[PDB]
Design a protein around this ligand. Structure first.
Ligand code: NAP
Ligand code: NAP
Ligand code: NAP
Ligand code: 2IT
Ligand code: 2IT
Ligand code: 2IT
Lengths: 459, 459, 459
């Protein structure tokens, strides 16, 4: 062996493995232990130097990656992250999670992830273009519409997807669904920008309906969100549409919180969206209207929103991994939070998860805080990417209503699958909510493990 | 020339050619003689050594084949056979037949067939895995989703399809519809397991309705089936569903016959299915319940079912080529059999066909035994494979009801095409049933010949 | 950034960088600092899961790697290591070193390295075969005669090269010089087995001639060697041929030392070679003749040879990285050792190198211990691999005398280049031997950096 330390990956692996062990899965199918050992080593990883030219004519060097984790269920599928933290450990945690998330969508998509330690912050659009051109010059050897289909993630938006697609088409001389999150006129899907955030909210609608026996909904609930990028923006918009209140957003430098009762409006979210297109911080817009209104908004530098929002009903971490600590989880519980779903991949620390799950086991019915893992709740994005692939393969574009209806059905089925799987393999005490994390993990893992066995990846 | 003796291929060719000559086709289009000469030489054949390792560590050698017969109408399409009889002659008869069968489906599929003289009987699942891995290591150079799309046949089930698909994906680094008969979670189609047997029964429903002017159906009819694999199992299930009685199944070692009035049940077929998954003989299950009940079941070693079932209304040979002799055909006629359709490819000997066709010409209307050739009646399997290809290209999965409805429409159109083509080119005496073998052959051949001419394969 | 800890790679990088800084190179060409930053990030790295079947039928999982570090001077070139220590850090140190080593040969070869954490010890030949088959099934996508040409290294012999070549030819359907160290009848080169060890000794012949003004040679010198594989065996044979005494060999479990005056003989080396073919330890042969003769041989469990050989004139570490500690370096100096050359890649710890170099600076002429780095002294192996590539591209085989003559010329030129480059850029005090490590590093680095600039890798 002599294996390197990969803490993020180890964290994701340990949480999956623990939930599988804490169930009857390996009593019924002890041979799945072998499947777990095999699935946890990626099929392929490509790492590559990316040399690019800055606006001053200087040579810059970054590291590029694509983790092609598992392809039993379909071609490798998952986003690209451009963030200075990026390394193999991080991309492996993401790619591993992606395998099981993709399994929960019901579409034929394997799991992968890639990106670079290139930091889009402080770069010109021209610099981003030159970087994407160099990056894809190498990546295009390894991907393709029936091989590996990337998309965005942190630091990769429609702008970067465009520069990447352009360079792929130029070298490969094929116009195909090699990327998703593409633009409307060049093979994009309606609802793809909305999909992840909408899906998180759709999934939580099912959680609320089940836990409260149809008595409550998002109508009148206070929802704390973190991040202010793609997932946070559209989760906020859907909450607002359903009559809920969005009481926080955040970024890497601080939190922007609603002061008292009230909500972000669609118009305010659009202004924040335009700020983030320009790669600027929330801190840069709080000096002018409307965000300078200290009666509506409180900007807190260096803080996450969880301890500053007061009473809340729903928390949707939608920024990055490990953004809810164990302490923060306890404060959310103390604030009356009954629903927590990950928009962000591995948004909760392990301490947070353990806190939420202990609370669920100790508190009957609607009194419990119910935790839904990202692989279930944030699967709407990759699901709609699958639909974008389907549209590109049909050579036709579907309506917003058609894509959105399918997204709703996928999120419903994903919730049902996790709920019913937990009821079957990790049956809770009477009156206790089944574990959506355990259920989702078992449901995704078994589907992958069985397909791997069929295909001779293990025996 | 100096051509080798290929008896099976020569048989299939001669029967097609004879039916074309015994019609007005070459009076109207004498240039189609040229088309016949060209179509009868395969576009490409690949043969290859397959070295594989047995459970004792010993080197084993088998022969692999893929016959890519014709691609005018679409990429090459047809199954893989693993049986110790396999050779080029056999695979050419099958691939030749496949061209015209595929033409009758209305889908864009060319004709091919392949396989190996590897005998799955007596092998471990591990040995089957190692064999499929070695086999596909070579075959993957020659096939692909827009080139050649294999599937199962005798000795190749979903298990083997899985091992084959896995190895293809590993080498080719593409996840695509390169095989059909795939598993549910990795690009399979609902109704594909059922398709061939269901389709045979659907086709015969049309034969019964036409011959009897709507007065009879499968309800209350006695149906003798041979084989006990994929085609026989599902043909039996559909018969049962329509209110018919299944009075025989068989395998390579003997026949299992219903003793008197009665039928196999769905539960019994499932037990036989599980036996065949384990690659065991019917002889191995007649020593225990329910098949040890000598009042319901008679096991006859070394026999085909035809002379042992007594009176029957419908015969569906569903095992292998040349499994109804001339003598057996006469006994079926003497037993009151009025409908005979091939589930198996070239199930009837030429003597049998001649006997059935002479009887049709000598006996008006419903008094005739009506013979339907495999290229018409068993086309449901490859049709649903085409639909599996369509689903994989759409990147979506259809419902059981959707696939089954399309299968029903395809079988109806295939019957109508053969019936109407025979009425046009080989017009029977008044009151005489048109020849479905002649009609089907002309309809499939002309479609292929005309497409070949358009594409410059002949002029 | 967020880069992982890669100690071996960092060690190799730091030693190169330090020698470049401790010279006039960056005074003359400060722009080469940019070249250093670019060259130190590999062009491409492929990592992949390797699933293989053991003799009991169980699924085994190992990790495979190919580091394609630099291709300015030619296609990527360097060995494969199968050892349980293997990871990316180790393969990056090796691949980095390979760039500059290959530059010193005068042949068009870029730098790479690969392998697996698969441990050949305790495996059957059948298990090694199945592993090599699985390994190359993936690796063959990334390599080729004009792309990347691997070879052996620790744990990869002609046996493994054969299984690897066979699988490549099977999938890729090309017979070409994709590997070196091939067998005599299937594209191997005479002198390739000998090349690394012979070359180390040839290089040291030049060191001795220069330091002693032609007065001494290997004739009558005592030479301590470590390892007992390919490099150690043939270095020992060449020493013996030149009239030197070989006074030690070793393996991972202990050292086999000559007791007093005397030498290993060719016959004894052949017996050790046959033992190592069988993957057995030196410990397993000391219980029988000739190695049980305690008057000729002392086996010391758990020891390296350096402190146990007494007085020695030349040390040739030929096993593995970091196998001469700082303390061991001082004992060799105290034992009269005047020449130390690395057969093994990064054989000396940094402490050892610093000790040897301090001694050289403090002691005039022949009184100094003279250290030659592996990139200079062990380059004969990869040089003869280049010649094997040349022979395969010519489609002809050269004589032993032709290959050996070219190897001698390459080792002479490599020595001259390092010596003269050190005299130019790191001029020693009068009477002090120039630094072969500094000279070799500058000569290899500048050639690569300049070719990279020409090709637009940096500007
Ligand atoms: N996009 C998708 O379809 C999709 C699908 C499923 C899951 N996800 C997950 O959802 C999360 C958000 O992704 P996104 O697509 O919304 O990305 P995005 O548009 O780049 O937004 C990321 C947001 O999170 C913040 N953030 C990122 N890294 C951070 C760090 N290390 N510390 C603190 N804050 C950080 C950003 O702050 P700054 O504004 O300061 O840069 C920004 O507000 C990620 O975990 C992602 O993997 C995304
Ligand atoms: N599967 C398809 O979709 C498809 C489509 C169209 C036509 N067909 C045709 O349908 C027939 C049956 O195929 P299948 O898919 O059902 O195969 P299968 O599942 O392997 O079953 C074949 C059955 O036929 C018996 N059999 C095979 N070779 C024989 C021989 N040489 N002598 C006596 N009995 C033999 C087998 O006996 P044992 O059990 O003793 O092995 C078994 O009961 C074949 O002619 C095939 O080409 C198949
Ligand atoms: N082969 C080439 O052409 C070539 C060219 C240039 C440089 N090199 C370098 O030369 C050195 C030897 O390679 P080789 O081709 O001779 O390999 P080899 O035939 O496998 O022999 C390696 C020898 O070193 C010992 N060894 C390996 N790893 C060890 C460890 N971690 N600790 C202690 N002892 C260890 C082995 O002991 P066991 O017998 O106990 O296994 C064996 O005696 C390596 O540094 C290699 O990279 C090789
Ligand atoms: O492929 C995709 O659409 C990726 C979506 C995403 N960034 C995720 O699931 O983490
Ligand atoms: O391609 C297929 O689905 C083949 C079906 C079959 N075995 C046949 O038509 O003979
Ligand atoms: O490519 C080769 O011949 C590699 C030789 C070697 N193992 C080295 O230089 O480390």
């Amino acid at each position: 062996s002599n294996l390197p330390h990969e803490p993020e990956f180890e964290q994701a692996y340990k949480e999956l493995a623990s939930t599988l062990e804490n169930s009857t899965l390996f009593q019924k199918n002890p041979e799945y232990r072998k499947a777990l050992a095999v699935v946890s080593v990626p099929e392929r990883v490509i790492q590559f130097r990316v040399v690019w030219e800055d606006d001053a004519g200087n040579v810059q060097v970054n590291r590029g990656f694509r983790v092609q984790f598992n392809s039993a269920l379909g071609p490798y599928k998952g986003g690209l992250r451009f963030h200075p933290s990026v390394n193999l450990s991080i991309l492996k945690f993401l790619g591993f999670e992606q395998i099981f998330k993709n399994a929960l969508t019901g579409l034929n998509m394997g799991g992968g992830k890639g990106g670079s330690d290139f930091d889009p912050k402080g770069k010109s659009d021209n610099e981003i273009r030159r970087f994407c051109v160099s990056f894809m010059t190498e990546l295009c050897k390894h991907i393709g519409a029936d091989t590996d289909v990337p998309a965005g993630d942190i630091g990769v938006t429609g702008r970067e997807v465009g520069f990447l697609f352009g360079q792929y088409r130029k070298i490969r001389n094929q116009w195909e669904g090699v990327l998703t999150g593409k633009g409307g006129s060049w093979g994009g899907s309606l609802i793809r920008p909305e999909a992840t955030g909408y899906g998180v909210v759709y999934y939580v609608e099912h959680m609320i309906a089940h836990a409260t026996n149809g008595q409550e909904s998002f109508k009148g609930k206070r929802v704390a969100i973190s991040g202010s990028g793609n997932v946070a923006q559209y989760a906020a918009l859907k909450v607002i549409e359903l009559g809920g209140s969005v009481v926080s957003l955040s970024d890497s430098q601080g939190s922007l919180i609603i002061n008292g009762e009230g909500s972000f409006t669609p118009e305010e979210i659009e202004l924040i969206a335009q700020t983030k297109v320009e790669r600027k911080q929330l801190a840069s817009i709080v000096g002018a209207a409307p965000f300078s209104d200290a009666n509506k908004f409180k900007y807190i530098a260096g803080a996450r929103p969880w301890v500053h929002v007061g009473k809340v009903d729903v928390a949707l971490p939608s920024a990055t991994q490990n953004e809810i600590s164990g302490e923060e989880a306890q404060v959310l519980i103390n604030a009356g939070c009954k629903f927590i779903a990950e928009g962000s991949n591995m948004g909760c620390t392990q301490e947070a998860i353990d806190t939420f799950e202990a609370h669920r086991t100790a508190n009957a019915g609607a009194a419990a805080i119910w935790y839904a893992p990202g692989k279930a709740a944030n699967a709407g994005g990759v699901a709609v990417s699958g639909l974008e692939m389907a549209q590109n393969s049909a050579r036709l574009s579907w309506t917003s209503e058609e894509v959105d209806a399918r997204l709703k059905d996928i999120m419903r089925d994903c919730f049902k699958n996790g709920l019913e799987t937990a009821q079957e393999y990790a049956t809770p005490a009477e009156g206790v909510l089944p574990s959506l994390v355990t259920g989702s993990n078992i449901a995704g893992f078994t589907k992958v493990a069985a397909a791997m066995k069929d295909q001779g990846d293990w025996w």
